[PDB]
Write an enzyme that holds these catalytic residues in place. Sequence first.
Site, PDB file in Angstrom:
ATOM      1  N   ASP A 150     -14.670  -1.424  10.843  1.00  0.00           N
ATOM      2  CA  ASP A 150     -13.801  -1.187  12.000  1.00  0.00           C
ATOM      3  C   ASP A 150     -13.202   0.204  11.901  1.00  0.00           C
ATOM      4  O   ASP A 150     -11.985   0.372  12.013  1.00  0.00           O
ATOM      5  CB  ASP A 150     -12.731  -2.255  12.079  1.00  0.00           C
ATOM      6  CG  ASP A 150     -12.091  -2.351  13.454  1.00  0.00           C
ATOM      7  OD1 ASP A 150     -12.413  -1.565  14.387  1.00  0.00           O
ATOM      8  OD2 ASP A 150     -11.250  -3.235  13.616  1.00  0.00           O
ATOM      9  N   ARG A 177      -7.441   4.169  15.758  1.00  0.00           N
ATOM     10  CA  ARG A 177      -6.388   3.182  15.603  1.00  0.00           C
ATOM     11  C   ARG A 177      -6.201   2.687  14.192  1.00  0.00           C
ATOM     12  O   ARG A 177      -5.127   2.241  13.841  1.00  0.00           O
ATOM     13  CB  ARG A 177      -6.596   2.000  16.542  1.00  0.00           C
ATOM     14  CG  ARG A 177      -7.852   1.225  16.287  1.00  0.00           C
ATOM     15  CD  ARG A 177      -8.054   0.019  17.247  1.00  0.00           C
ATOM     16  NE  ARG A 177      -9.358  -0.525  16.913  1.00  0.00           N
ATOM     17  CZ  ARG A 177     -10.513  -0.060  17.391  1.00  0.00           C
ATOM     18  NH1 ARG A 177     -10.505   0.861  18.308  1.00  0.00           N
ATOM     19  NH2 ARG A 177     -11.671  -0.546  16.939  1.00  0.00           N
ATOM     20  N   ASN A 178      -7.268   2.743  13.406  1.00  0.00           N
ATOM     21  CA  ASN A 178      -7.298   2.275  12.009  1.00  0.00           C
ATOM     22  C   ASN A 178      -7.287   3.341  10.943  1.00  0.00           C
ATOM     23  O   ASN A 178      -7.572   3.038   9.775  1.00  0.00           O
ATOM     24  CB  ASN A 178      -8.497   1.317  11.799  1.00  0.00           C
ATOM     25  CG  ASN A 178      -8.389   0.095  12.647  1.00  0.00           C
ATOM     26  OD1 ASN A 178      -7.283  -0.324  13.031  1.00  0.00           O
ATOM     27  ND2 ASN A 178      -9.524  -0.483  12.972  1.00  0.00           N
ATOM     28  N   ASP A 233      -7.323  -0.105   5.977  1.00  0.00           N
ATOM     29  CA  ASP A 233      -7.810  -1.409   6.439  1.00  0.00           C
ATOM     30  C   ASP A 233      -9.344  -1.607   6.418  1.00  0.00           C
ATOM     31  O   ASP A 233      -9.889  -2.471   7.068  1.00  0.00           O
ATOM     32  CB  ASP A 233      -7.196  -1.717   7.812  1.00  0.00           C
ATOM     33  CG  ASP A 233      -5.698  -1.787   7.739  1.00  0.00           C
ATOM     34  OD1 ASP A 233      -5.175  -2.551   6.922  1.00  0.00           O
ATOM     35  OD2 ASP A 233      -5.044  -0.999   8.458  1.00  0.00           O
ATOM     36  N   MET A 272       2.388   5.937   4.906  1.00  0.00           N
ATOM     37  CA  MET A 272       1.841   7.049   5.677  1.00  0.00           C
ATOM     38  C   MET A 272       2.849   7.355   6.788  1.00  0.00           C
ATOM     39  O   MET A 272       2.881   6.661   7.786  1.00  0.00           O
ATOM     40  CB  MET A 272       0.451   6.729   6.218  1.00  0.00           C
ATOM     41  CG  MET A 272      -0.535   6.467   5.152  1.00  0.00           C
ATOM     42  SD  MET A 272      -1.066   7.879   4.184  1.00  0.00           S
ATOM     43  CE  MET A 272      -2.121   8.602   5.328  1.00  0.00           C
ATOM     44  N   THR A 288       0.797  -1.219   0.000  1.00  0.00           N
ATOM     45  CA  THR A 288       0.000   0.000   0.000  1.00  0.00           C
ATOM     46  C   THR A 288       0.822   1.257   0.000  1.00  0.00           C
ATOM     47  O   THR A 288       2.057   1.243   0.230  1.00  0.00           O
ATOM     48  CB  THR A 288      -0.934   0.035   1.250  1.00  0.00           C
ATOM     49  OG1 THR A 288      -0.144   0.174   2.469  1.00  0.00           O
ATOM     50  CG2 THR A 288      -1.808  -1.177   1.299  1.00  0.00           C
TER      51      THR A 288
HETATM   52  C1  LIG Z   1       5.521   7.304  13.439  1.00  0.00           C
HETATM   53  C2  LIG Z   1       6.735   6.374  13.317  1.00  0.00           C
HETATM   54  C3  LIG Z   1       7.592   6.548  14.581  1.00  0.00           C
HETATM   55  N1  LIG Z   1       8.631   5.500  14.682  1.00  0.00           N
HETATM   56  C4  LIG Z   1       9.481   5.691  15.892  1.00  0.00           C
HETATM   57  C5  LIG Z   1      10.387   6.945  15.935  1.00  0.00           C
HETATM   58  O1  LIG Z   1      11.427   6.090  15.410  1.00  0.00           O
HETATM   59  C6  LIG Z   1      10.809   4.890  15.899  1.00  0.00           C
HETATM   60  C7  LIG Z   1       7.945   4.189  14.766  1.00  0.00           C
HETATM   61  C8  LIG Z   1       7.239   3.908  13.437  1.00  0.00           C
HETATM   62  N2  LIG Z   1       6.244   4.963  13.169  1.00  0.00           N
HETATM   63  C9  LIG Z   1       5.444   4.712  12.004  1.00  0.00           C
HETATM   64  C10 LIG Z   1       5.612   5.400  10.808  1.00  0.00           C
HETATM   65  C11 LIG Z   1       4.761   5.127   9.753  1.00  0.00           C
HETATM   66  C12 LIG Z   1       3.800   4.093   9.867  1.00  0.00           C
HETATM   67  N3  LIG Z   1       2.999   3.867   8.764  1.00  0.00           N
HETATM   68  C13 LIG Z   1       2.125   2.792   8.543  1.00  0.00           C
HETATM   69  C14 LIG Z   1       1.748   1.883   9.493  1.00  0.00           C
HETATM   70  C15 LIG Z   1       0.859   0.839   9.115  1.00  0.00           C
HETATM   71  C16 LIG Z   1       0.471  -0.209  10.102  1.00  0.00           C
HETATM   72  C17 LIG Z   1       1.443  -0.776  10.938  1.00  0.00           C
HETATM   73  C18 LIG Z   1       1.109  -1.759  11.841  1.00  0.00           C
HETATM   74  N4  LIG Z   1      -0.122  -2.235  11.969  1.00  0.00           N
HETATM   75  C19 LIG Z   1      -1.073  -1.772  11.163  1.00  0.00           C
HETATM   76  N5  LIG Z   1      -2.327  -2.282  11.287  1.00  0.00           N
HETATM   77  C20 LIG Z   1      -3.264  -1.717  12.231  1.00  0.00           C
HETATM   78  C21 LIG Z   1      -4.681  -1.752  11.742  1.00  0.00           C
HETATM   79  N6  LIG Z   1      -4.945  -3.066  11.160  1.00  0.00           N
HETATM   80  C22 LIG Z   1      -3.960  -3.851  10.542  1.00  0.00           C
HETATM   81  C23 LIG Z   1      -4.591  -4.936   9.993  1.00  0.00           C
HETATM   82  C24 LIG Z   1      -5.961  -4.814  10.304  1.00  0.00           C
HETATM   83  C25 LIG Z   1      -6.141  -3.686  10.969  1.00  0.00           C
HETATM   84  C26 LIG Z   1      -7.570  -3.433  11.304  1.00  0.00           C
HETATM   85  C27 LIG Z   1      -8.290  -4.794  11.021  1.00  0.00           C
HETATM   86  C28 LIG Z   1      -8.441  -5.527  12.354  1.00  0.00           C
HETATM   87  C29 LIG Z   1      -9.629  -4.562  10.337  1.00  0.00           C
HETATM   88  C30 LIG Z   1      -7.272  -5.512  10.097  1.00  0.00           C
HETATM   89  C31 LIG Z   1      -2.615  -3.393  10.492  1.00  0.00           C
HETATM   90  O2  LIG Z   1      -1.816  -3.968   9.698  1.00  0.00           O
HETATM   91  C32 LIG Z   1      -0.833  -0.733  10.216  1.00  0.00           C
HETATM   92  C33 LIG Z   1      -1.942  -0.154   9.384  1.00  0.00           C
HETATM   93  O3  LIG Z   1      -2.441  -0.954   8.332  1.00  0.00           O
HETATM   94  C34 LIG Z   1       0.442   0.785   7.802  1.00  0.00           C
HETATM   95  N7  LIG Z   1       0.801   1.711   6.856  1.00  0.00           N
HETATM   96  C35 LIG Z   1       0.231   1.544   5.503  1.00  0.00           C
HETATM   97  C36 LIG Z   1       1.631   2.713   7.194  1.00  0.00           C
HETATM   98  O4  LIG Z   1       1.976   3.560   6.362  1.00  0.00           O
HETATM   99  N8  LIG Z   1       3.637   3.501  11.017  1.00  0.00           N
HETATM  100  C37 LIG Z   1       4.425   3.741  12.053  1.00  0.00           C
END
Ligand SMILES: C[C@H]1CN(C2COC2)CCN1c1ccc(Nc2cc(-c3ccnc(N4CCn5c(cc6c5CC(C)(C)C6)C4=O)c3CO)cn(C)c2=O)nc1
Length: 271
Positions: free
Chosen positions: A133, A137-138, A151, A89, A86
């Site tokens: 959902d 958080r999502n 999601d 973000m 994807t």
């Molecule tokens: C902000 C910085 C800070 N950093 C610190 C400072 O240095 C260390 C840590 C990392 N962090 C960071 C930056 C960018 C991102 N970006 C992304 C996160 C996610 C992501 C990550 C983990 N879990 C999920 N979830 C959460 C939701 N969800 C998932 C699967 C499912 C769901 C809902 C469901 C139950 C219907 C099914 C699922 O996979 C997602 C969202 O899809 C996805 N996408 C596309 C991103 O771009 N994330 C984290």
Amino acid sequence: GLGYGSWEIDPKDLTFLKELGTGQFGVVKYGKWRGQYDVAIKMIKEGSMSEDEFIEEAKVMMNLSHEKLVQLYGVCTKQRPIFIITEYMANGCLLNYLREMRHRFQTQQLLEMCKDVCEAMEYLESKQFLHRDLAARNCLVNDQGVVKVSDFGLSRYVLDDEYTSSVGSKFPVRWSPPEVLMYSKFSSKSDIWAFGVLMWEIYSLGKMPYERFTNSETAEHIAQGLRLYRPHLASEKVYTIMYSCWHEKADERPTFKILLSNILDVMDEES
Ligand SMILES: C[C@H]1CN(C2COC2)CCN1c1ccc(Nc2cc(-c3ccnc(N4CCn5c(cc6c5CC(C)(C)C6)C4=O)c3CO)cn(C)c2=O)nc1
């Protein structure tokens, strides 16, 4: 090229760069596609997903495109774990973003976040596509502070009974209307209910809805007609909008188109 359909990404085109955490299906990573394009990669933990059903649905979800909706680019399904590729973000999940008090958001910025989501949801509503959902958080936040929906629809493919069961530990009880909790009556109007809870999360800077209740108590509360109340940063006009999402009668709740027009009106009145 040879072997890959329009929905299929060649995983050898991916460079993995950073861990982004773990969700319902396991680890998510940031990387590049063909050395250049930022992407996120879900790595689908085995046993966590109804994979064949998802893959058939991924073909349809490939045709969904909106500026406030996290873009699906493709899937990698020729080996396990499968990948979902994807849009990336950079500022991560909306819930964590709201909870970082340093941002000290102005109320106009909180309303823009609600609008970003509402636009995505109107789009999905226009395509008869339920989220199921919707919650802070999502949602995800990009490097420009734009909030996008993510999601959507994936709840249908989750295999974890603690998530799927209405009395499970992971079920979104606090984002659910009474008819979902009572009868499993899912509709556009249950997304509407959830959106109102999401506006409340935004204006509450990521407090837990019903923070002093359990899920069980929350279900009873809402079934008796009691509701969340006005966050301190929400004007009366904003609170009226979120509250309108919580009508006991699903058919008296607004549509996302009506919500959008209401949010724009408030923006014109309050900024
Ligand atoms: C902000 C910085 C800070 N950093 C610190 C400072 O240095 C260390 C840590 C990392 N962090 C960071 C930056 C960018 C991102 N970006 C992304 C996160 C996610 C992501 C990550 C983990 N879990 C999920 N979830 C959460 C939701 N969800 C998932 C699967 C499912 C769901 C809902 C469901 C139950 C219907 C099914 C699922 O996979 C997602 C969202 O899809 C996805 N996408 C596309 C991103 O771009 N994330 C984290």
